[PDB]
Design a binder for this molecule. Structure first.
Ligand code: K
Ligand code: K
Ligand code: K
Ligand code: K
Ligand code: MG
Ligand code: MG
Ligand code: MG
Ligand code: MG
Ligand code: MG
Ligand code: MG
Ligand code: MG
Ligand code: MG
Ligand code: MG
Ligand code: MG
Ligand code: MG
Ligand code: MG
Ligand code: ZN
Lengths: 96, 129, 97, 87, 206, 150, 25, 217, 81, 121
RNA sequence: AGGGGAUCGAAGAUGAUCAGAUACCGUCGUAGUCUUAACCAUAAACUAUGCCGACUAGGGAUCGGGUGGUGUUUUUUUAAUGACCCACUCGGCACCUUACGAGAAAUCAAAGUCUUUGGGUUCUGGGGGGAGUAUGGUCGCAAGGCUGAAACUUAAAGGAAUUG
RNA sequence: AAGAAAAUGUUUU
């Protein structure tokens, strides 16, 4: 055999085995455990509002250079602090 | 242990054919095996076959004619509806113009064409082409 | 990958083989894996057979031999050249030289 | 293979091995066609008249071409006691 | 289909038994040679000279069916068969390859080499494995002088005979050439002993 | 094969194709049945009855000669044992192993073999209870196995 | 770092963590 | 000119063999690309890709170029050649030659009914090269070639009009994917069918019909 | 090979084959009429006897069990039934 | 080192291959004949070629060497024409006019040939 | 925890080497190594290949059993055991050749009979880390074992082979 | 028969 039951009356084992092994997928596990609601500062939402607390110069990883001018932001929704990039040439002068 | 004598017989036939032998011995040669072989022979995929009567389940010597690409069982014997026969033929057969999905129906063991023109269905037994 | 078809030893159907100690360094090696050579050296060759025979009190003494089975670990056998690294195809030659 | 109105629309109906009945593919370069000369009236090896056997590269590679040719020849004549069905 | 004239005659049967053609290999015999007559003690297996003769005549018929005599290539790398194949290619219009086979003679369509035969005859499949391999590459049928332990891979017409004996190899090549000539018409009647003497094919050590 | 081992032995009796008595056999079926009953009264199990019958007599198979199996004949004649012969011998082996084990107490291999033997006993007893050869409440107990084999 | 010695270090860390956990109450 | 070697090539030049179907029927080894040139004049070539391959040697980066070429006519005949050379143009030329030498026939058929001019494959076929397996499935009329661009180009050069493709393995290994599709195409004439069950009289080779085409006068 | 008569194997090949591997399995054992030193009966003895068969009306050992075929006590006459 | 290169070895090879009924095993006449029978573009190369030709002549005089095919192909030709003519094809003689075969060989002969002189020992 | 403790010998003591060398090397040496009565339950516990069943190449050895021989030898008194030789067979540890076939390859008689995909069945994996960690449970005297995440982090990590 | 010491080399092309 192929290491899985083939019997006409083995549907229970087949579906339970699939259920057990679906936990090894990232997205299925995240969705079924609701990680994005508990973890994930954006509590499962696409966008979030926050208050800039400090400008940061984050050194870029190798093989690059040129620190990236992010901001530390405290979200209104949950109070969690995150770091957010400020993308464009300049555009940190627009954020206070 | 042996769970499908039909699977053993068809596997033996497949191995003999793909090695190019013109004959093959299969044991223990049940009634389902004989009916499957009869469908095969009626459609010309094997030649004459002989039942050797030992006072056990028996043996069968099949004459092969090189026309057999592959014969195999479908295990388990899935229940098949009339509409599902087409899906099974599409999945198992190389083309729509030849090859046969062999079913066990209450009207007897037959190929899928005979099943369709008798308007009967049953459980899937195997295939041949 | 797997360098050797069986393994670098001779143990199929056994499971466990008692070890021996390498004569050179005392490393523990399974007896089936150890490189074993027998030494049958004449008790005095030393370019000295004729001189010992002349000194002998017996005519035609038939001087004896020393017999010693030497077991080497892989490292010591390679280092002392009892065995040599061989090409991939020559490794499969079990015949002695 | 034919279409409607029964005209051969498939090119190159291929040869089949005389021993195993499998198709001799265009790239089967171990396959071999053997002509055995027909013999009339004490020899003379009539030119252009043969019995033809096609053996597939599979049979030749498995080393069964000798026994296969023994059997086919003996069935067609050309051999009196070389091949035995029982063995 | 073969008349009683083609049937084996006692003169060449005596020739074969004297040349020791029937002395097959030891208990080591390939399980693809049913040419084994009942095996005598001391281990040597007796080759059925009748089957050897029938196979030789079939091989001769194939050779005679080849349209151009030059398109038949007779090959020997072993010394015992070099003179045999040279005399074969002399008496018949065959093309000989004695000694080294220069691999790439059937593939590798270049000058100084590259015969393109319609048939290849070898004295030993084991020692002529290179020629057999190339013939398998280019669709060339093979007749081989095969002993009970000779390989049968890509050998279409096996003539079962001793290949350990210079006498046996020379006689088998002699008989093959004689029957090819008889079929061709070079020998008008299949009753004359073919006066050309059956040691001209034998190897010459001194 | 070898339910409780890795062995793949195929050695077994190859009974003949002929289902009739051999032409050289002249004893009557009733005579063979009398011999079977005499051996049973002496206390032989069906296996050793058949062994004796084929060895010292000419009866190749009591089934082909008398038309009945030896154990069936014994049951018909009222000589059937309390437990089937194979189960009895399995229990006897289990008893012997258990005695050897309570002696010297360190034969871990004997412990393993006892596990195997009693597993075989329980499977056979389950089959016999299923076909109602044994009572449905029949239970193999190590404390009673010796007293039930003797 | 050799996996065996990483294992050793991890075991020591687990023991120390358990000790501190038990020291708390 | 050509000045052929390969008596098959001699016959083709002399006009004794006029179709490549005879070569396919007799499984004749083709060694000269001029044979294919004269027997299939309407053979178009496509360069599927050029990729650099590198051999490290003593400052290394030998940096040769490997080209994959598919030739064919959109009726029954396709060939695949892969050649590495020091320059891209040379690789392409030699690959075209190799593909022409490799030209094989494809057995086209009908998905369903028998309405003329086969549009699809006669059977399901599969071909494997490396990890890449390519499966060709007969498709109904109007389906087109459901395949990736390279396999689709190979199939239309072969002459298929309706086919489904399934693939497994590292299909981004284009060389292996094309070789697997080529093997799948070639197996179409190696699959035995009931319409090919009929026994044939085993025709005579042209090398024997015209045997006086290997000599020097 | 690739062609052989599986329904008609040669007698030599069948005799070479294992008793369970013949076309139809059957015993290779047999029964013998053995002349007991007494009289009134010729004893029937299985070739592969496991029992120390004695005469019906005497007490001489007629065969001795072995791994395979039984022995015959070195004084006896025996016919094969 | 005085190993002759391929341009000398093959030049001497061809010279000896087509000029054996020609220049002897003496270097002084060998080089003079090479002057006429070959267009060698330097005196040093001509001397090398002539010396190797002389060496090859000297070792040919003690037996043929590999890859040398001059009019040696006429002698070999004759010594290839026979080594036993009208003597004994190891046949019907060297015996009591019989064949010394074995038992199984006698059964083989009795399979078809009723007439063969056999002396099975 | 008793017994035993010759030898070797985690720790340790020591001489040397060394830039350092409470490392390799040298000399000792505790626990240990052995045993009994209990614990522990883990190893690259490996064939890194679950188990049962069928089929598909060639070959020669070898272990156990069996069969046969005008066999060799061994003596008992015709014969017979034993050992050996030859042939055959079942079962086993393996091996050699070729791979139709399989595979990414190394290689594989299974790792084959798989896109021509289904003989039965158990267990396990789903990119690399974090981590066999945290937490809970359970077992253990302990060392620990079994079960066992996530946050977060990351574009490789990895297998086989090729040329340097 | 065997033969001491030899640690290190910044980031991105
Ligand atoms: K950086
Ligand atoms: K950069
Ligand atoms: K101690
Ligand atoms: K940088
Ligand atoms: Mg390594
Ligand atoms: Mg272990
Ligand atoms: Mg079994
Ligand atoms: Mg079990
Ligand atoms: Mg110190
Ligand atoms: Mg010490
Ligand atoms: Mg301990
Ligand atoms: Mg573990
Ligand atoms: Mg493991
Ligand atoms: Mg993961
Ligand atoms: Mg690597
Ligand atoms: Mg660096
Ligand atoms: Zn060592």
């Amino acid at each position: 055999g192929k290491g899985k039951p083939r019997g006409l009356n083995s549907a229970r084992k087949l579906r339970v085995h699939r259920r057990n092994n679906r936990w090894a997928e990232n997205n299925y596990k995240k969705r079924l455990l609701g990680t994005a609601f508990k973890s994930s500062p954006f509590g499962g939402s696409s966008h979030a509002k926050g208050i800039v607390l400090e400008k940061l110069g984050i050194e870029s990883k190798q093989p690059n250079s040129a620190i990236r001018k992010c901001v530390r932001v405290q979200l209104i929704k949950n109070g969690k602090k995150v770091t957010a990039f400020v993308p464009n040439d300049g555009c940190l002068n627009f954020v206070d | 242990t042996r769970s499908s004598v039909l699977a053993d017989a068809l596997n033996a036939i497949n191995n003999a054919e793909k090695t190019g032998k013109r004959q093959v011995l299969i044991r223990p040669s049940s009634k389902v095996i004989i009916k499957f072989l009869q469908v095969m022979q009626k459609h010309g995929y094997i030649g004459e076959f002989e039942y050797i009567d030992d006072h056990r389940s028996g043996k069968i010597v099949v004459q092969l004619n090189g026309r057999l690409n592959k014969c195999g069982v479908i295990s388990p014997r899935f229940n098949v509806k009339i509409g599902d026969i087409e899906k099974w033929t599409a999945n198992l057969l190389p083309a729509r113009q030849f090859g046969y999905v062999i079913l066990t129906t209450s009207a007897g063991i037959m190929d899928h064409e005979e099943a369709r023109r008798k308007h009967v269905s049953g459980k899937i037994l195997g295939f041949v082409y | 990958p797997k360098k050797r078809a069986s393994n670098g030893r001779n143990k199929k159907g056994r499971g466990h083989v008692k070890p021996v100690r390498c004569v050179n360094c005392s490393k523990s090696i399974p007896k089936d894996k150890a490189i074993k050579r027998m030494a049958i050296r004449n008790i005095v060759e030393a370019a000295a057979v004729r001189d010992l025979s002349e000194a002998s009190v017996y005519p035609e003494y038939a001087l004896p031999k020393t017999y010693n089975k030497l077991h080497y670990c892989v490292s010591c056998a390679i280092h002392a050249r009892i065995v040599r690294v061989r090409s991939r195809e020559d490794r499969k030659n079990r015949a002695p030289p | 293979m034919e279409n409607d109105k029964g005209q051969l629309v498939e090119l190159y109906v291929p040869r089949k091995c005389s021993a195993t009945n499998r198709i001799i593919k265009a790239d089967d370069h171990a396959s071999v066609q053997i002509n055995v000369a027909k013999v009339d009236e004490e020899g003379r090896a009539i030119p252009g008249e043969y019995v033809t056997y096609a053996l597939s590269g599979y049979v030749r590679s498995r080393g069964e071409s000798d026994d296969s040719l023994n059997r086919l020849a003996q069935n067609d004549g050309l051999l009196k006691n070389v091949w035995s069905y029982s063995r | 289909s073969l008349p009683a004239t083609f049937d084996l005659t006692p003169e060449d049967a005596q020739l074969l038994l004297a040349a020791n053609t029937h002395l097959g290999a030891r208990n080591v015999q390939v399980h693809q040679e049913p040419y084994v007559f009942n095996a005598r003690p001391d281990g040597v297996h007796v080759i059925n000279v009748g089957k050897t003769w029938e196979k030789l005549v079939l091989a001769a018929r194939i050779i005679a069916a080849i349209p151009n005599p030059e398109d038949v290539v007779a090959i020997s790398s072993r010394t015992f068969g070099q003179r045999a194949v040279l005399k074969f290619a002399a008496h018949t219009g065959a093309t000989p390859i004695a000694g080294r086979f220069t691999p790439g003679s059937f593939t590798n369509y270049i000058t100084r080499s590259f015969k393109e035969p319609r048939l290849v005859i070898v004295t030993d499949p084991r020692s002529d494995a290179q020629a057999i391999k190339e013939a398998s590459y280019v669709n060339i049928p093979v007749i081989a002088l095969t002993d009970l332990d000779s390989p049968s891979e890509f050998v279409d017409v096996a003539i079962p005979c001793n290949n350990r004996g210079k006498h046996s190899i020379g006689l088998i090549w002699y008989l093959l050439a004689r029957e090819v000539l008889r079929l061709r018409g070079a020998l008008v009647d299949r009753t004359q002993p073919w006066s050309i003497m059956p040691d001209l094919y034998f190897y010459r050590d001194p | 094969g070898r339910m409780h081992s890795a062995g793949k032995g195929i050695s077994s009796s190859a009974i003949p194709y002929s289902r009739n008595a051999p032409a050289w056999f002249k004893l009557s079926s009733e005579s063979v049945i009398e011999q079977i009953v005499k051996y049973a009264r002496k206390g032989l199990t069906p296996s050793q009855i058949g062994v004796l019958l084929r060895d010292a007599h000419g009866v190749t198979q009591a089934r082909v000669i008398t038309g009945n199996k030896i154990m069936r004949i014994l049951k018909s004649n009222g000589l059937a044992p309390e437990i089937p012969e194979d189960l009895y011998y399995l229990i006897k082996k289990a008893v012997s192993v258990r005695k050897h084990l309570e002696r010297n107490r360190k034969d871990k291999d004997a412990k393993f073999r006892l596990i195997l033997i009693e597993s075989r006993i329980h499977r056979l007893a389950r089959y016999y209870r299923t076909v109602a050869v044994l009572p449905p409440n029949w239970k193999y107990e190590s404390a009673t196995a010796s007293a039930l084999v003797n | 770092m050799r996996a065996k010695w990483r294992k050793k270090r991890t075991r020591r860390l687990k023991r120390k963590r358990r000790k501190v956990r038990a020291r708390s109450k | 000119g050509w000045v052929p070697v390969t008596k098959l090539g001699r016959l083709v030049k002399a006009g004794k063999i006029t179709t490549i179907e005879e070569i396919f029927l007799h499984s004749l080894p083709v060694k000269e690309f001029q044979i294919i040139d004269t027997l299939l004049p309407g053979l178009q070539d496509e360069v599927m890709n050029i990729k650099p391959v590198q051999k490290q040697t003593r400052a290394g980066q030998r940096t040769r170029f490997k080209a994959v070429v598919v030739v064919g006519d959109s009726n029954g005949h396709v060939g695949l050649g892969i050649k590495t050379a020091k320059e891209v143009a040379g690789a392409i030329r030699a690959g075209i030659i190799i593909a022409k030498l490799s030209v094989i026939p494809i057995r086209r058929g009908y998905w369903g009914t028998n309405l003329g001019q086969p549009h699809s494959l006669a059977t399901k076929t599969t071909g494997k090269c490396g990890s890449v397996t390519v499966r060709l499935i007969p498709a109904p009329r109007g389906s087109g070639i459901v395949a990736s661009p390279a396999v689709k180009k190979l199939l239309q050069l072969a002459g298929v009009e309706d086919v489904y493709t399934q693939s497994n393995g590292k299909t981004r290994t284009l060389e292996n994917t094309l070789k697997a599709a080529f093997v799948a195409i070639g197996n179409t004439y190696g699959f035995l069918t009931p319409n090919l069950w009929a026994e044939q009289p085993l025709p005579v080779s042209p090398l024997d019909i015209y045997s006086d085409e290997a000599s020097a006068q | 090979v690739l062609v052989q008569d599986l329904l008609h194997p040669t007698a030599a090949s069948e005799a070479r084959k294992h008793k369970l591997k013949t076309l139809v399995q059957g015993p290779r054992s047999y029964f013998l009429d053995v002349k007991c030193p007494g009289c009134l009966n010729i004893t029937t003895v299985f070739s592969h006897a496991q029992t120390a068969v004695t005469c019906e009306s005497c007490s001489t050992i007629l065969c001795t069990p072995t791994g395979g075929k039984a022995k015959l006590s070195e004084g006896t006459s025996f016919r094969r039934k | 080192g005085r190993v002759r290169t391929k341009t000398v070895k093959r030049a001497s090879k061809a010279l000896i291959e087509r000029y054996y009924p020609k220049l002897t095993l003496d270097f002084q006449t060998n080089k003079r004949l090479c002057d006429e029978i070959a267009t060698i573009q330097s005196k040093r190369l001509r001397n090398k070629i002539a010396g190797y030709t002389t060496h090859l002549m000297k070792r040919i005089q003690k037996g043929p060497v590999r890859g040398i095919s001059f009019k040696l192909q006429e002698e070999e030709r004759e010594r290839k024409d026979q080594y036993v003519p009208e003597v004994s094809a190891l046949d019907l003689s060297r015996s009591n006019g019989v064949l010394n075969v074995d038992n199984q060989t006698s059964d083989l002969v009795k399979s078809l040939g009723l007439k063969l002189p056999l002396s099975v020992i």
